[PDB]
Amino acid sequence: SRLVLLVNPNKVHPPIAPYALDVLTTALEDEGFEVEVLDLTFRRDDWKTCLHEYFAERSPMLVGVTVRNTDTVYAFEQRPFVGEHREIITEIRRLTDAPVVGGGIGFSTMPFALVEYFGIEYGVKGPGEKILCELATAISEGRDTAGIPGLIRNTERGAVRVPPAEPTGQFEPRVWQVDQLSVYRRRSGVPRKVDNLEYYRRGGLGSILTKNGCAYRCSHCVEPDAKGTRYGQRELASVVDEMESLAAQGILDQHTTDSEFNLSIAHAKNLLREIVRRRHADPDNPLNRLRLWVYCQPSPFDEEFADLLAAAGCRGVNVGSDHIRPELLSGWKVTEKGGTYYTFEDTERLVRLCRERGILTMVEALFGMPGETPETVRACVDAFMALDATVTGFSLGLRLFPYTPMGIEIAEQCAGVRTAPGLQSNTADGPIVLKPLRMCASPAEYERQFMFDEHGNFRLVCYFSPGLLPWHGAVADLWALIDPADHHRVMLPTVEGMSEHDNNYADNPFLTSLGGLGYTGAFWSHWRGREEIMRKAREAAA
Numbered sequence: 001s002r003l004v005l006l007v008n009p010n011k012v013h014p015p016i017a018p019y020a021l022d023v024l025t026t027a028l029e030d031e032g033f034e035v036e037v038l039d040l041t042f043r044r045d046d047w048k049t050c051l052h053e054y055f056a057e058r059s060p061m062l063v064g065v066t067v068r069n070t071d072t073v074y075a076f077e078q079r080p081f082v083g084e085h086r087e088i089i090t091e092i093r094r095l096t097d098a099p100v101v102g103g104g105i106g107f108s109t110m111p112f113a114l115v116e117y118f119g120i121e122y123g124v125k126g127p128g129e130k131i132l133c134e135l136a137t138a139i140s141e142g143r144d145t146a147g148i149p150g151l152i153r154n155t156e157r158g159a160v161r162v163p164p165a166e167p168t169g170q171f172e173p174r175v176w177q178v179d180q181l182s183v184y185r186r187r188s189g190v191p192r193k194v195d196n197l198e199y200y201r202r203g204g205l206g207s208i209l210t211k212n213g214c215a216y217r218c219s220h221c222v223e224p225d226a227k228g229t230r231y232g233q234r235e236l237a238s239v240v241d242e243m244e245s246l247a248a249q250g251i252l253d254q255h256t257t258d259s260e261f262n263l264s265i266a267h268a269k270n271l272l273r274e275i276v277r278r279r280h281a282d283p284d285n286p287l288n289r290l291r292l293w294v295y296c297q298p299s300p301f302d303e304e305f306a307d308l309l310a311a312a313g314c315r316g317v318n319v320g321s322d323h324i325r326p327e328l329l330s331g332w333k334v335t336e337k338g339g340t341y342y343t344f345e346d347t348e349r350l351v352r353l354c355r356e357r358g359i360l361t362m363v364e365a366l367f368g369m370p371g372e373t374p375e376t377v378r379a380c381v382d383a384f385m386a387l388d389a390t391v392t393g394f395s396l397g398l399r400l401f402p403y404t405p406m407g408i409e410i411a412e413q414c415a416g417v418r419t420a421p422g423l424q425s426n427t428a429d430g431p432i433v434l435k436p437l438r439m440c441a442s443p444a445e446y447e448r449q450f451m452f453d454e455h456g457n458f459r460l461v462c463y464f465s466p467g468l469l470p471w472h473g474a475v476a477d478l479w480a481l482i483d484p485a486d487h488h489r490v491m492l493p494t495v496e497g498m499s500e501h502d503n504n505y506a507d508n509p510f511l512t513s514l515g516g517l518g519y520t521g522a523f524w525s526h527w528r529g530r531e532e533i534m535r536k537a538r539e540a541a542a
């Protein structure tokens with residue numbers, strides 16, 4: 001048999017197409033395998049029926065599950081998804097004896113812990129298209145898997161990784177894991193394949209990857225480890241081919257899925273040049289209606305980059321400025337060498353250049369990192385609000401993960417013998433004592449503590465700066481900083497009982513409605529006029 005099943009357990013709406021499965025499908029099929037996708041995003045109330053019918057009819061020899069999100073990563077909410085993922089995986093193993101392999105960005109933040117927690121045979125950390133093809137080949141040919149480089153295997157004593165070596169595989173480049181040549185085929189209306197048009201009609205977005213990895217080391221961010229610490233760039237022609245394929249299907253709003261679009265800047269500029277060239281070469285090319293949405297850091301973002309974004313069809317930029325105070329940004333928004341890489345001028349210039357070219361902007365602020373006080377919060381709010389960005393998103397509190405510098409540093413402070421100031425969890429019974437990796441018997445133990453307590457219960461560990469103590473009181477003080485005239489243009493942690501204003505797209509009811517109302521683009525691009533969109537919605541409901 002050469003049949004591989006790939007399952008999407010993501011239930012979050014507004015729906016986001018599981019891009020990962022399209023990458024894996026292309027790689028597998030190019031290797032001569034047959035691939036079928038079971039997408040449960042639109043089968044929330046009857047996914048068991050979807051599983052029952054499939055496994056009675058088909059016999060895949062390997063089942064793959066993509067775990068995009070471990071949780072919402074919203075410190076005030078602490079809503080896990082891995083329990084619901086485990087429930088789906090448990091139903092799968094009930095229905096078949098074929099091995100199960102796990103993967104995903106969120107999966108790669110704690111792959112050893114999840115392999116043991118899900119109780120599955122295999123897992124991959126980072127990009128999986130090359131490792132999965134070798135795994136499927138080994139299973140199909142009846143071969144041993146003990147020599148598959150990069151494969152995490154679930155032994156009877158626990159999850160153990162084949163070296164590609166850090167036993168955790170932390171902070172590797174992972175460029176060798178990336179398929180840098182192929183066009184990732186994006187299909188629509190095809191049974192048992194990812195239905196990209198369905199996601200566009202119902203959620204509002206398409207997606208495009210230009211490069212894997214991030215070379216920086218921001219203390220809050222899981223991506224350098226979970227994705228890779230060096231850039232694996234794709235062929236530009238293959239990227240633009242895929243974008244043209246999406247545009248041809250009518251998927252005009254495309255969100256880049258790079259860690260940061262403007263990092264590895266020469267490749268991003270050469271990408272925009274190729275898009276502009278094809279747009280100019282033929283007016284019928286559907287890229288002429290492209291609406292590109294991107295992630296950026298405040299630097300590098302120069303006038304040439306801004307001109308290219310405008311000409312290629314960029315419609316909005318989300319910039320993770322995160323803060324203004326150098327005392328807070330130091331040791332936080334840093335490169336691998338430990339130095340900062342932007343100032344507030346860079347965000348000011350980014351917002352100005354996008355304004356001059358009719359490109360919308362969202363500026364991110366993350367409150368509660370070490371050093372944060374009420375006066376540091378007020379300083380960031382006053383300065384950020386004066387940028388006149390389209391949307392200004394204020395988040396408060398940090399979710400800790402085993403392979404972020406904050407996760408490691410706070411585990412260092414605990415040293416396995418005491419709790420650390422600022423540690424928080426909504427489900428904690430007493431002191432949260434974390435253990436550094438070197439004090440743990442296995443990767444699984446070091447990784448699991450950031451999500452579970454000793455008794456196996458969910459205990460999603462967060463950090464809140466003790467300087468924000470007299471952490472809900474800070475929310476009321478943060479709301480007071482925003483002028484009522486500016487309420488419409490901010491995202492904020494929501495006070496008691498109010499409608500959702502949070503910078504949180506996971507099951508946001510207003511954002512869930514936009515698809516049915518025909519709105520598209522980044523989920524923040526219509527935040528400003530939500531009052532009018534709601535008024536208009538009840539006008540056609542009557």
Ligand code: B12
Pocket residue numbers: 010012013014015016017019020021023024064065066067068069070071072073074101102103104105106107108109123124126127128129132205206207209221222223227255256257258259503504505506523
């Ligand atoms: C773009 C983006 C978004 C966009 C999506 C745009 C779109 N139309 O696709 C928006 C803004 C909507 C968004 C929303 C959210 N996101 Co987001 N987002 C990203 C980002 C930057 C790229 C995701 C992506 O598509 N990558 C490209 C795909 C192809 O790669 P991949 O999924 O990782 O897949 C590869 C590997 O993981 C592997 N793999 C994957 N699955 C499998 C399966 C198997 C079996 C195997 C073997 C291998 C394997 O192989 C794949 C091919 O190389 C990621 C970080 C990142 N750099 O990936 C964050 C990220 C995934 N998002 C994150 C979060 C928290 C969210 C939200 C929950 C935020 C919120 N509270 O609303 C929501 C969830 C929305 C949803 N419906 O699921 C977190 C996840 C953290 C965690 N621990 O899980 C990340 C890591 C951001 C961060 N730095 O913390 N997101």
Ligand SMILES: CN(CC[C@H](N)C(=O)O)C[C@H]1O[C@@H](n2cnc3c(N)ncnc32)[C@H](O)[C@@H]1O
Pocket residue numbers: 073074075220221222223258259260295320322364365366395397398399400
């Ligand atoms: C959008 N981010 C930059 C783009 C990045 N590629 C990503 O998808 O996270 C920055 C924002 O992500 C959020 N964020 C990232 N990691 C965490 C985390 N561990 N806890 C809380 N918020 C986080 C913060 O709001 C931060 O301002």
Ligand SMILES: N[C@@H](Cc1c[nH]c2ccccc12)C(=O)O
Pocket residue numbers: 072073074318362364393503504505524
């Ligand atoms: N603010 C992000 C989405 C988001 C919300 N909460 C998050 C937590 C972690 C990472 C991203 C997010 C955006 O506008 O695109």
Ligand code: SF4
Pocket residue numbers: 214215216217218221222223224259260297320
């Ligand atoms: S915040 Fe952006 S630049 Fe910093 S590590 Fe994460 S993805 Fe890279």
